[PDB]
Write a protein that binds this DNA or RNA. Structure first.
Ligand code: ZN
Lengths: 42, 783
RNA sequence: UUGUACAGUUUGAGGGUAUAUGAUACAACCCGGUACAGGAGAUAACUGUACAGG
């Protein structure tokens, strides 16, 4: 339904995912620094 | 460094930084070092002070309820602390509310005059019986800090020769005689003895006591503070009303006493940023220290100055002004002082770890006062040892008062205010504490653990059942009666022990005493002996140790055990020739004399022998006979049965002591011992004709009901009734000779309840007409 | 017995069901084409906790 809070994966859910933490981001942003609510394309 | 981020890849260590930031926002941090028990520990939580192994474990911990509620409490505390000082209108409203409360429930000058009139009337009534005594008002009556409902406490001082119990009993007698006081009663077993009365015209409960030290001085100190500083009294009355609404002033339910808050009401003034009430002890006087503060103590007050004395453990006496001699005393309104008081007690002071004292500015550490850090502690100025806030000993009650303080501070930090129980408690209900059992849940008045409350009528006694009771009593006497050969063996054992002891300490003489020579000798009972030295500052401990060492040499004696913690140190061992326990004491002449008295009491009639033997077997069956277990010794039970026999419609046995004085060890040992002509000097001899079984059933009935242990002492010395108060004692039994030794002093409450239950069960089994054996039914542990 | 609070198992009640057009004999979920986020599972008995007892 949604990407894991850690690793940004899709195989497991937020609670299901338990692997070590990974950089926060979304595949749409494509970069760690950029944030969805403020992107160049918008 | 438990772990280093250099290992992680750039994206990896960046994500690890984000994870650490998130954990930090939840009050979870890293570990500088790890314990040997948990080498895998890598995190910790400050709120719970809890170690954590890994990041997954940390994320698991936050999900729990512990951290959630801790963070909620932290948020509430932050909200409380963020509030700024109150605005002038709000503080004026609070002051008006305090004024209204004091006017409605506070004391007035008319009340003080009326109480003075009560005291004068009591003085006039008491002149004919206690002309030299002088009465004064203390506590709430004289302090003005209490409520009009609060009782009238009157202390009567007497010449040093007179004794407190005697003066108080005489006061009760005069109160009973007079008609101005109705409902005269005595509560002599409270914290301080009191006589409670209710004057007819006044209707105000008055408690009369005497010799109340540390109370008159304390109330006069509070009165001086109130007179000199008018701002104190409104705060004290408001705080007392708050305590009453929160239901913590009464110490019966485990709360703090009512007047304690007064000591606290001044305290926050003392510890405030500007001390309104100056301290009375400190480094001002020469040779002062915190360790010496205990010796330092307030002595008296007069002419607006407190005089205090210091005695080294040279004497230093000095007077200090009660109030600061400063013209710039701040004009803080009462409401501001009240709000600052609430803030001080909530989120600005350590109630748990600091002692509330008004003598020294620097907060005395609980360790210096050798007090626990679990709960509140209030220091009374005129009694250093006492911790006046000890009535609260249950953590739930502490949490309740803390919640009351928190809610009232939040409420107190067209504005209108009011003192209400619901607002302060916020729906929480108190937690009554049983002061009698030290437990929680049941009030003293109704509680499962009340032996006195422990009844149904007995069935009628048929002649056959009475005959059966007499037969079983005689059977017990015969079964437990030592034979002649047993007496000869005991004499030989005593002689052998004396001879063996003489080897190391020549001249030693041994005399048998106790069950062996007191007329009531139990089969297989302990052999009690007393050792003396011919022609002889002797240390009981060293002598007992030497005797035990000597006995250890003997092959026959094994498991030698010297005991010195007891009042009379003794050597207890096992003799193979007797095959029984043997106890040896040193210079226990008083024991021999009391045993001889009991022997005479047995010799007068055989009914006494039968009764004592049946009592001993009944006690042994219930597992209360042995003294080492903490229960009353068999001597206490034989004393009880003798006392019962003496005090009965037909007097079975007379008081030998009552019917020249010889002082050995410091007490009189006289008692009529010529039984042969006893009837001549005794006018009631032969009046008793009840059967042994009937007499024993009467004994059980008398002790189960028709007797009081709290208000009477089981003493065989006096035919007349004796009262516990006159002995200043608070089951209690007095020796026939020594009046300062109580056999029930070491008896715990639980064992007393069990003993009363055993007596009730014995009364139930006996006296009920109706087992494989007749004897067994009357003596059965299960029933 | 006493004041307290959570480690595995079950039922009853919860958050979720937004981002889809066709299917699937009683033998078969499918190409999600747009919802926005710094957010990570609550209640009762099943004998395992860490503080106070006296
Ligand atoms: Zn994932």
């Amino acid at each position: 339904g949604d990407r894991c809070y850690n690793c940004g994966g899709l195989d497991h859910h937020a609670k299901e995912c338990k692997l070590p933490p990974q950089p926060k981001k979304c595949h749409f942003c494509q970069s760690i620094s950029h944030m969805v609510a403020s992107c160049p394309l918008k | 460094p438990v772990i280093d981020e250099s290992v992680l890849s750039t994206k990896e260590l960046l994500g690890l930084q984000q994870a650490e930031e998130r954990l930090k926002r939840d009050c979870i941090d890293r570990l500088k070092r790890r314990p040997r028990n948990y080498p895998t520990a890598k995190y910790t939580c400050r709120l719970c002070d809890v170690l954590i192994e890994s990041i997954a474990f940390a994320h698991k911990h936050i999900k729990e309820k512990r951290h959630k509620k801790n963070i909620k409490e932290k948020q509430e505390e932050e909200l409380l602390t963020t509030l700024p000082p109150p605005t002038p209108s709000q503080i004026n409203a609070v002051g008006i509310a305090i004024d209204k409360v004091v006017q409605e429930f506070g004391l007035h000058n008319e009340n003080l005059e009326q109480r003075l009139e009560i005291k004068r009337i009591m003085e006039n009534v008491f002149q004919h019986k206690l002309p030299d005594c002088s009465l004064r008002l203390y506590g709430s009556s004289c302090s003005r800090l209490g409520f009009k409902n609060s009782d009238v406490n009157i202390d009567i001082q007497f010449p040093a020769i007179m004794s407190q119990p005697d003066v108080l009993l005489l006061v009760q007698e005069c109160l009973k005689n007079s008609d101005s006081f109705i409902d005269v009663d005595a509560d002599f077993h409270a914290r301080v003895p009191v006589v409670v009365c209710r004057e007819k015209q006044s209707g105000l409960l008055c408690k009369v006591s005497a010799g109340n030290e540390n109370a008159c001085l304390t109330t006069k100190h509070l009165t001086a503070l109130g007179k000199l500083e008018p701002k104190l009294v409104p705060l004290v009355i408001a705080f007392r009303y708050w305590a009453k609404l929160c239901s913590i002033d009464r110490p019966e339910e485990g709360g703090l006493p009512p007047y304690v808050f007064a000591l606290m009401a001044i305290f926050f003034l003392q510890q405030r940023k500007e001390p309104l009430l100056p301290v009375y002890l400190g480094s001002w006087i020469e040779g002062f220290s915190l360790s010496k503060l205990g010796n330092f103590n307030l002595q008296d007050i007069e002419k607006d100055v407190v005089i205090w004395e210091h005695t080294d453990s040279p004497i230093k006496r000095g007077q200090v002004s009660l109030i600061l001699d400063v013209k710039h005393q701040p004009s803080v309104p009462v409401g501001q002082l009240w709000v600052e008081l609430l803030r001080f007690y909530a989120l600005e002071f350590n109630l748990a770890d600091l002692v509330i004292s008004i003598r020294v500015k620097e907060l005395v550490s609980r360790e210096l006062k050798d007090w626990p850090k679990k709960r509140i502690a209030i220091e009374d100025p005129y009694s250093v040892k006492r911790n006046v806030a000890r009535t609260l000993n249950s953590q739930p009650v502490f949490e309740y008062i803390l919640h009351c303080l928190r809610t009232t501070y939040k409420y107190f930090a067209d504005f209108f205010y009011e003192f209400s129980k619901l607002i302060f408690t916020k729906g929480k209900s108190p937690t009554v504490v049983c002061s009698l059992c030290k437990r929680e849940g049941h009030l003293k008045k109704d509680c499962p653990e009340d032996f006195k409350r422990i009844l149904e009528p007995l069935p009628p006694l048929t002649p056959k059942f009475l005959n059966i009771l007499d037969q079983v009593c005689i059977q017990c006497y015969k079964d437990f009666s030592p034979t002649i050969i047993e007496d000869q063996a005991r004499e030989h054992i005593r002689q052998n022990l004396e001879s063996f002891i003489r080897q190391d300490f020549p001249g030693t003489k041994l005399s048998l005493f106790g069950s062996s020579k007191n007329g009531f000798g139990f089969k297989q009972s302990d052999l009690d002996v007393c050792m003396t030295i011919n022609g002889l500052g002797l240390d009981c401990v060293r002598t007992i140790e030497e005797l035990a060492r000597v006995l250890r040499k003997h092959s026959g004696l094994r498991n030698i055990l010297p005991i010195t913690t007891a009042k009379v140190p003794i050597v207890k061992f096992f003799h193979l020739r007797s095959g029984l326990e043997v106890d040896i004491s040193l210079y226990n002449t008083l024991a021999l004399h009391n045993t001889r008295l009991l022997s005479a009491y047995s010799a007068i009639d055989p009914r006494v022998k039968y009764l004592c033997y049946t009592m001993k077997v009944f006690t042994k069956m219930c597992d209360i006979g042995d003294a080492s277990r903490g229960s009353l010794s068999s001597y206490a039970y034989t004393l009880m049965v003798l006392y019962f026999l003496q005090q009965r419609n037909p007097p079975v046995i007379p008081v030998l002591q009552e019917i020249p004085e010889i002082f050995v060890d410091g007490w009189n040992i006289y008692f009529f011992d010529q039984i042969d002509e006893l009837p001549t000097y005794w006018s009631e001899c032969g009046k008793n004709t009840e059967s042994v079984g009937q007499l024993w059933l009467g004994l059980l009935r008398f002790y189960t009901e028709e007797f009081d242990f709290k208000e009477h002492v089981i003493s065989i010395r006096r035919k007349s009734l004796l009262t516990t108060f006159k002995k200043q004692w608070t089951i209690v039994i007095e020796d026939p000779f020594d009046l300062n030794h109580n056999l029930g002093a070491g008896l715990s409450r639980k064992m007393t309840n069990f003993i009363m239950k055993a007596f009730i069960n014995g009364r139930r089994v006996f006296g009920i007409p109706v087992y494989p054996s007749k004897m067994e039914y009357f003596f059965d542990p299960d029933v």
